[PDB]
RNA sequence: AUACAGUGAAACUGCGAAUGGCUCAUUAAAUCAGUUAUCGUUUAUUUGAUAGCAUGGUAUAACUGUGGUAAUUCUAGAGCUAAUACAUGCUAUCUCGACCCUUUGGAAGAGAUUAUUUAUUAGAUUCUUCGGACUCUUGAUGAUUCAUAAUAACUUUUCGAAUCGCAUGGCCUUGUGCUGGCGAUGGUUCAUUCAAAUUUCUGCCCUAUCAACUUUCGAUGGUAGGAUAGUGGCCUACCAUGGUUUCAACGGGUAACGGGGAAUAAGGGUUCGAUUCCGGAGAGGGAGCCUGAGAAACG
């Protein structure tokens, strides 16, 4: 699907002139996010439009980069991850099994399943609950 | 007034908060300048700092540009033909960004005649235009897409739909009618 | 009321305008000379 | 008469097929004063952004309605102006009127006419009494003051030079926009006398660093088959001026090139009339002059098109004798000395046909 | 806090001004000026509590408006003008000049100075950019902008600038192993050579420095103010030379 | 203070001074750089609709920019007070004889409640309402909405018993008759339906008609007359039919004006006859005697209109529109100036001797 | 949905808003009902 | 001093009154404490850079008189007069330089000569006179579709000194010709300065005689649109049903405003936390609203 909604989904300011008959009639801009992180070929040469895409969307990753594991995948372009860690209990002088759930935007370029180990980064907040955009997946 | 924050909404763990402090000036919400076709009516609002935001409520003239040739001109408006916000808004003729409209073709016709000498309808390599757009010229009635935010600048600046997106929104128009 | 001091103020205003124009032009010319010489070298 | 909504009111009622578009008899009776008010609205100086905005508005206004209205507008412009001095004489003026106000009228006319050309590129006609007479009269006044006065009136001499340059460029623009709409033989004698007065005298010494409107106008003269009238009217004065430009080695390659596309066009275009043989022999002398060129003065497109000129010379054979064949072998050795990496296989094969 | 705060209580005054505690309850706030808010030093405190040429605020005011004090070749006139780090003060009836600098404990202190050194000053080249007409410019720490700068200038540099005329004299890169000044941090104020520079990609870029008593320590490029080469400091340091016993 | 027709005297006691083609804002700038009855009879930007309260003393108006309601009084002859709301109201009505309770259909797909104490909470509607009316024998706010729904809510119940069905895309015009408490709804698709309360059943469906130019109509008025028995419908070609209560034959037929849609058709209990009033976006308002169906008068306001009202007694016509001033009109030929503006008899004398 | 669903949910202020009102009927509804019968249906 | 000039009433105009000060009743990540973002934004002023007609208009306060009323920090009516008041408006440079010249260069000539809104671009990644020649393939970050630079227009719309002190010169066709001192006020943009606005990471009292929850009216996001300084279920139009969890969600209990500090048994740690510091919140009821850089002020 290329017209998944009732508006002409396209990245803005890109104009391909019909006057010139270039072989590549669909111009796809992207950006090397860098930060020591690679840009997937599926992203740089996909056929999807995503403004929240960490590598093709008009939002930059910056600040904090965090790791997690995929829990639920019943949701479009966004996946929640689980962080487990140790706790600071002074009374019994111990740790404790702690868990947290962090929803994060995911780009259609990457492929995800439940149980994958993924890394995400901080971006400008987009929705009421989401705060982050993925940058890599990894098999587990 | 029209609030802006989100503490009035529930939490993400299934809970409802309480009141923290009253509405302040730095979370203002204001009226949409829902513009209809009419006499150019622009209102000035002095906003935070020394800003001057102009909101239009009736408009009959806007600036629109042809892309492939690369020209731009002031022009009238017939009126909205489509806007994915609400078809009822389209019917009521509410001007808004990312909307589809019908616009006059006589200014571009005069431009083409003056610059080219070949009258559209009925330097050929540079005078070739799309079949749909030249039929629109012959009828005198062209299409366009407006994407200027109304209640920010009171301006209506857009482009005439080129072949791919022109046919895209034309098939949308036909699926409507 | 038109005054000799108003005339003086007018001539001074024009003088300062042309003065800063000249100074800006001189700074631009010197920067251009310096850039040309460094790029050649 | 209002100012703050002028473009709005124009684009609302005054456009045809628009709201309250003016009927035929209504415009017939009211346009004259509409012409006068727009004469004022163009006489307004655009020394600010909004002022130039309304000026571009009015210049977009003019090419809408119909032509005779604009023709009468230009007639009123010329009536404010005059050419009857010159044309009660032939190239004389009894009362030399070079006043700064008069030249201001001249310049305002130049501005309006060039703006009208720019906005009405093709559909404009040439109302002779308002296009031929006033432009030549203006440039004649420019030359008159140039040769009469000293350098003392710096303002007057400066605006005279600017007026002359603008007249040349606007005449070139109108010529290239009409092409061959109609025969201008009414004043070809006068306009070509004006052309031959300063140009062929001093066409190479001054206008040699960057391309000139005169040069491109002469290129159009060679290009259009009906524009050889000057060439065949004078004893190839323009051809000799072009030859002098070619011979002058201080001219830049991007100026000399267009001379050579013009030469290619004029060689290609055949006319079975008098002096065409002398003209093509003069272009043979031009080839003799360009023999050392293309490698000491002159650029892939230019070298390719000059090679095509040489090829076409070979096929059509307007130059045949042993002298020009020795010159052709000299050109061949020069151009084979020249590079071939930045060329095309077809261009090399055309070199092979020359050989 | 409805809006801006225009006071400073005495106790929360910047602890590196070393005001006496039991004098009152209010502190002098520097105005808006060429230096920051926590790390400046106003003429009022410099005259009342460093030069001691004063006994009372109104006395400082009187001297100021009689205009014996000009800052960086420019007469100031308030009691709140915020002189900043490595700055110039000039008094004529004394033939005194003051290079305002830091000490071992990180306070400001004076440096008696004569004209041949007062005539120059050194901005930390901090932000290079270009604007309208594509004209170039550089931004030093003091909030001073310099249009049409030398293309041989990059970020994190130190440029020696004339004061009266205002044209650049020269400058100095950021190069490893050079005499430099650390502005902030726990152990700010010491001077040594930067053996190398660790880089974090858009992060804290830590730097290791040896001091002339030959000891290693760690700073950051935000706190480092480049001074000069080995054996050639370009500004007459106050005694101590970064040695802490 | 003017007069348009020659045989009949009318009066633009309030309105624009200059007729057409010149900006009202530019005009006021110029002239104020260089006589009103009710000061600030004005929103200065636009106006949507006026409903005079049943007390005959209030004037509620909807102003567009900074959407708000103007509350004029005739005792003070000025603004009682203004009140801002969120969006420019589409439909409003004063439930009581006084404006103490007012309810307005708001284009944000919602309904809002002005009260003397304040503004009671807004409530949404599932489908965009198009025409809201209050049934006054059974306390009902019912709106023909976007599509096939005619939503309903009671002032004792507060639920939605059933959104009634109108088998067309839109609900073009609605009226309720209380002489016979029936429901009338005309639709641009040339379909008019009549519904019966106490039985929740539509009782009529009719009005398949075409014009001379062969185009489906746009019925912007579906009202009735003072008797509450015969009804009138009005549509785009200056086309007004008037039916009786139980006939398919148009009792009155007319076409006039232009292709611009007639905006309101209103009866008038004239002293000896019944009169009829059209307001149309041909920028026109015309006066007939119904029995002759004859054009006793025609009036050109020189600026177009969005809504009109008449004073219950006689003489005054409020007109709320997109203009800078919403304006009122006096007719001497149907009655004198109302009591609070009694001196306009003298004003009429002044214009006549003028 | 957001606010586009019709559920017959209780609204206290409007339920006790202004009711009750009068039976403002100028007829007995019997002739009215037989007049409905005698409308354009017959 | 025959324009005024000293002094200074009133009044007009500018600036400022959002600081300071007080109060603790609220609230268990609500702020808070620490940290970060701003490649998510606005900024009076300070400070730095920054801009190619001898001078015009009206319309008034303070003033004077007449009043009225029982009447205010009452008004009417009439007659005056200024702007940093209001509203208006005017004034030669840069490219190649043939040719002359050698110095030092001119020299006709062909050329270019503030802000708004959109669109389209750029802004990419070997020989040796062993004495010497090159005879080849913007900055920025981790990055921005950045800065910038341009094209075309576009704008109910911007300024681009119609002021001002102290002195008072310079030249000379001694004209009152033409220039010119020190410095206040204004005004563009950027920078910078004080903030502000959101937001990353962690950390809350007792509690299961509270296991189930939001999911409507948004409870999760997407698309799309309006909303300011800016993204945003901020709001809304269409799709999906997400999401807390005994890893106690959820609610409930706190005459607990938060933090720091203090006392406290010798030693576990226990008590005020009221103090003099830094945050938060606030003053007949409510709402609408006005200014201004800054506000739901207490005006």
XYZ file of C-alpha atoms in Angstrom, chain E residues 125-217:
93
model
C 36.450 31.857 19.679
C 33.271 29.929 20.481
C 30.676 30.097 17.697
C 31.519 30.629 14.023
C 28.630 31.173 11.619
C 27.425 33.205 8.627
C 24.346 35.246 7.889
C 22.723 37.867 5.687
C 24.545 38.327 2.374
C 26.353 35.169 3.444
C 28.690 37.356 5.492
C 30.870 35.437 7.975
C 31.306 36.104 11.661
C 32.712 34.617 14.847
C 31.372 34.780 18.412
C 33.707 34.996 21.396
C 32.794 34.109 24.988
C 32.325 37.781 25.937
C 29.339 38.058 23.616
C 31.511 39.992 21.166
C 30.916 39.276 17.486
C 33.591 39.724 14.822
C 32.366 39.796 11.242
C 34.677 38.870 8.374
C 36.928 36.655 10.543
C 40.026 34.825 9.356
C 38.997 31.592 7.585
C 41.902 30.063 9.518
C 39.683 30.286 12.629
C 37.616 27.359 13.916
C 35.633 26.665 17.079
C 37.254 26.548 20.532
C 40.048 28.974 19.658
C 41.620 31.975 21.397
C 41.972 35.237 19.468
C 44.019 38.243 20.589
C 42.126 41.424 19.676
C 42.899 45.124 19.721
C 40.617 47.173 21.954
C 40.611 50.734 20.607
C 40.582 50.053 16.862
C 38.854 46.690 17.239
C 40.693 44.808 14.509
C 42.163 41.367 15.158
C 45.815 41.165 16.112
C 46.243 37.387 15.901
C 44.839 34.103 17.191
C 45.674 30.607 18.409
C 44.253 27.172 17.549
C 43.316 24.357 19.892
C 46.417 22.149 19.702
C 47.500 19.416 22.104
C 50.234 20.207 24.604
C 49.764 23.942 25.089
C 49.492 26.416 27.961
C 45.753 26.838 28.519
C 43.398 28.026 31.236
C 40.589 25.931 32.693
C 37.578 28.098 33.533
C 35.148 25.850 35.405
C 35.250 22.574 37.268
C 36.344 21.526 40.728
C 40.050 22.141 40.046
C 39.652 25.086 37.684
C 42.327 27.771 37.516
C 45.398 25.562 36.974
C 47.539 25.946 33.860
C 49.352 23.179 32.000
C 49.634 21.487 28.606
C 46.878 19.347 27.111
C 48.562 16.022 26.375
C 45.645 14.988 24.143
C 41.888 15.326 23.723
C 39.290 12.611 24.193
C 36.221 13.014 22.016
C 32.647 11.937 22.555
C 30.476 12.268 19.481
C 28.401 15.254 20.517
C 29.129 14.441 24.156
C 31.423 15.386 27.040
C 34.827 15.629 25.342
C 37.188 15.110 28.245
C 40.796 16.309 28.139
C 43.884 15.236 30.064
C 46.353 17.908 31.180
C 49.727 17.772 32.909
C 50.667 20.596 35.261
C 54.149 22.091 35.598
C 54.567 20.350 38.925
C 54.065 17.413 36.537
C 50.687 16.118 37.609
C 47.817 14.770 35.541
C 44.227 15.986 35.784
